[PDB]
Amino acid sequence: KLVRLPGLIDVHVHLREPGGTHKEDFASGTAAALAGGITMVCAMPNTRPPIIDAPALALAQKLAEAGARCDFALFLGASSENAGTLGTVAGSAAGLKLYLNETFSELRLDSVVQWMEHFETWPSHLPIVAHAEQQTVAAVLMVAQLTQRSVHICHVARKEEILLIKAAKARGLPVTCEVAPHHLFLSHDDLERLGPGKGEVRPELGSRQDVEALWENMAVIDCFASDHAPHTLEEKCGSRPPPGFPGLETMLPLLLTAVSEGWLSLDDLLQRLHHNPRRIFHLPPQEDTYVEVDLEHEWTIPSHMPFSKAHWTPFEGQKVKGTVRRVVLRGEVAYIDGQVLVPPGYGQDVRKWPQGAVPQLP
Amino acid sequence: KLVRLPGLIDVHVHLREPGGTHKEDFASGTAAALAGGITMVCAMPNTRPPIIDAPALALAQKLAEAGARCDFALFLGASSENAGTLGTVAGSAAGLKLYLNETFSELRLDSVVQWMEHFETWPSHLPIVAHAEQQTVAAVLMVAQLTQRSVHICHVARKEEILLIKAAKARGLPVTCEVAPHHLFLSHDDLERLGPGKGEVRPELGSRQDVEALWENMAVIDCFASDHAPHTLEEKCGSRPPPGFPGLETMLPLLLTAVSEGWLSLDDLLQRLHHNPRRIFHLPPQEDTYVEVDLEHEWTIPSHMPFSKAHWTPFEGQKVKGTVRRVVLRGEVAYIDGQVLVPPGYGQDVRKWPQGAVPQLP
Ligand SMILES: NC(=O)N[C@@H](CC(=O)O)C(=O)O
Ligand SMILES: NC(=O)N[C@@H](CC(=O)O)C(=O)O
Ligand SMILES: [Zn+2]
Ligand SMILES: [Zn+2]
Ligand SMILES: [Zn+2]
Ligand SMILES: [Zn+2]
Ligand SMILES: [Zn+2]
Ligand SMILES: [Zn+2]
Q: Which residues contact A43 (CB under 8 A, 6 or more apart)?
A: A13, A14, A15, A60, A64, A72, A73, A74, A75, A94
Q: Which of A355, A358, A360 to mutate to test the interface with B (most CBs of B within 10 A)?
A: A355
Give the integer Cα–Cα distance in Å for A26 and A166: 35
Omega before B18 cis (within 30°)? yes
What sign results for the dihedral spanned by CA atoms B41, B42, B45, B49? positive
- Report whether B280 contacts A276 (CB < 8 A): no
CB of A217 less than 8 A from some CB of B: yes
Cα dihedral: B183, B188, B192, B196 (round 10): 70
Short-list B142, A42, A311, B349, CA closest to B357: B349
Burial profile B242-254: b = 16 or more Cβ within 10 angstroms, e = fewer: bbbbbbbbbbbbb
Give the integer Cα–Cα distance in Å for A227 and A164: 21
Dist. CA A12 → ligand 5 center (Å)? 6
Set of chain B residues whose Cβ sits within 8 Å of the Cβ of A3: 359-362
Instruction: Tell me, using a 6 A CB cutoff, whether residue A274 lines ligand 1.
Output: no
Instruction: Tell me, using a 6 A CB cutoff, whether residue B131 lines ligand 2.
Output: yes
- Active-site annotation of B, residues: 227
Contact B267 A359 (CB under 8 A): yes
Widest pairwise Cα distance in chain A: 56
Give the integer Cα–Cα distance in Å for A78 and A107: 7
Short-list A198, A227, A187, A184, CA closest to A14: A227
Give the integer Cα–Cα distance in Å for B210 and A106: 51
Give the integer Cα–Cα distance in Å for A48 and A51: 8
Give the integer Cα–Cα distance in Å for A78 and A89: 13
- Report whether B247 contacts B224 (CB < 8 A): no
- For chain A, the first-to-last Cα distance in angstroms comes to 49
Is A268 in the active site?
no
Strand order through the sheet with B8-13:
B8-13, B38-43, B71-74
Contact B3 A267 (CB under 8 A): no
Ligand found nearest the CA of A246: 1
Cα dihedral: A182, A184, A190, A193 (round 10): -40
How far apart, in Å, are the Cα atoms of A20 and each of A57, A93, A321? 16, 21, 33
Residue A226 Cα, gap to closest chain B Cα (Å): 21
Omega before B314 cis (within 30°)? no
CA–chain centroid gap for A228, Å, is 6
How far apart, in Å, are the Cα atoms of B173 and each of A332, B152, B344? 40, 11, 41
Give the integer Cα–Cα distance in Å for A165 and B55: 49
Contact A360 B271 (CB under 8 A): no
Q: Which residues contact B59 (CB under 8 A, 6 or more apart)?
A: B18, B49
Q: What is the resolution of this structure in A?
A: 1.5
A30 burial level (CB within 10 Å; 0-12, 13-18, 19+): buried
The amino acid at A152: H
Give the integer Cα–Cα distance in Å for A161 and A180: 14
- Report whether B78 contacts B109 (CB < 8 A): yes
Give the integer Cα–Cα distance in Å for B193 and B179: 23
Give the integer Cα–Cα distance in Å for B26 and B343: 11
Dist. CA B317 → ligand 8 center (Å)? 24
Ligand found nearest the CA of A12: 4
Cα dihedral: A144, A146, A149, A152 (round 10): 10
Short-list B103, B79, B41, CA closest to B244: B103
Give the integer Cα–Cα distance in Å for A307 and A43: 17
Q: What is the phi-psi region of residue B237: left when phi exceeds 0, alpha when psi lies from -120 to 50, beta otherwise?
A: alpha
Contact A362 B295 (CB under 8 A): yes
Q: Which CATH superfamily is domain B3-346 in?
A: Metal-dependent hydrolases (3.20.20.140)
E strand intervals along chain A: 3-6, 8-13, 38-43, 71-74, 76-77, 96-99, 128-131, 151-153, 175-179, 223-224, 290-300, 319-329, 332-336, 339-340
Give the integer Cα–Cα distance in Å for B310 and B22: 8
Dist. CA B152 → ligand 7 center (Å)? 8
CB of A125 less than 8 A from some CB of B: yes
Give the integer Cα–Cα distance in Å for A140 and B124: 39
3-state percent helix, strand, coil for chain A, nearest multiple of 5: 35, 20, 45
Query: Which approach determined this entry?
Result: X-ray
Dist. CA B184 → ligand 2 center (Å)? 17
Q: What is the 3-state secondary structure (H, E, C) of chain B?
A: CCEEEECEEEEEECCCCCCCCCCCCHHHHHHHHHHCCEEEEEECCCCCCCCCCHHHHHHHHHHHHHHCCCEEEECEECCCCCCCCCCCCHHHCCCEEEECCCCCCCCCCCCHHHHHHHHHHCCCCCCEEEECCCHHHHHHHHHHHHCCCCEEECCCCCHHHHHHHHHHHHCCCCEEEEECCHHHHCCHHHHHHHHHHHCCCCCCCCCHHHHHHHHHCHHHCCEECCCECCCCHHHHCCCCCCCCCCCHHHHHHHHHHHHHCCCCCHHHHHHHHHHHHHHHHCCCCCCCCEEEEEEEEEEECCCCCCCCCCCCCCCCCCEEEEEEEEEEECCEEEEECCEECCCCCCCCEHHHCHHHCCCCCC
Set of chain B residues whose Cβ sits within 8 Å of the Cβ of A1: 362
Q: Which residues contact B134 (CB under 8 A, 6 or more apart)?
A: B158, B160, B161
Short-list A234, B53, B55, B25, CA closest to B43: B25
Q: Which of A171, A265, A268, A291 to mutate to test the interface with B (most CBs of B within 10 A)?
A: A265
Instruction: Tell me, using a 6 A CB cutoff, whether residue A227 lines ligand 1.
Output: yes
Instruction: Tell me, using a 6 A CB cutoff, whether residue B12 lines ligand 2.
Output: no
Short-list B75, B9, B58, B91, CA closest to B357: B91
How far apart, in Å, are the Cα atoms of B153 and each of A17, A161, B12, B130, B229? 47, 30, 11, 5, 17
Instruction: Tell me, using a 6 A CB cutoff, whether residue A12 lines ligand 1.
Output: no
CB of B6 less than 8 A from some CB of A: yes
Give the integer Cα–Cα distance in Å for B225 and B112: 26
Domain A3-350 belongs to what architecture?
Alpha-Beta Barrel (3.20)
Give the integer Cα–Cα distance in Å for B335 and B337: 7
Give the integer Cα–Cα distance in Å for B214 and A21: 52
Burial profile B156-187: b = 16 or more Cβ within 10 angstroms, e = fewer: bbbbbbbebbbebbeeeebbbbbbbbbbbbbb
Task: Give the pairing type, strands B175-179 and B151-153.
Answer: parallel
Give the integer Cα–Cα distance in Å for B199 and B314: 8
Dist. CA B201 → ligand 7 center (Å)? 14
Beta-bridge mates of residue A339: A336
Short-list A272, A267, A289, CA closest to B281: A267
Give the integer Cα–Cα distance in Å for B45 and B17: 10
- Please check if A231 is assigned to a binding site: yes
Please count the residues of chain A: 362
Give the integer Cα–Cα distance in Å for A185 and B8: 38
Give the integer Cα–Cα distance in Å for B315 and B304: 9
Mutate to test the pocket of ligand 2, among B10, B103, B156 (most ligand atoms within 8 A of CB): B103
Contact A287 B287 (CB under 8 A): yes
Task: Give the pairing type, strands A290-300 and A3-6.
Answer: antiparallel
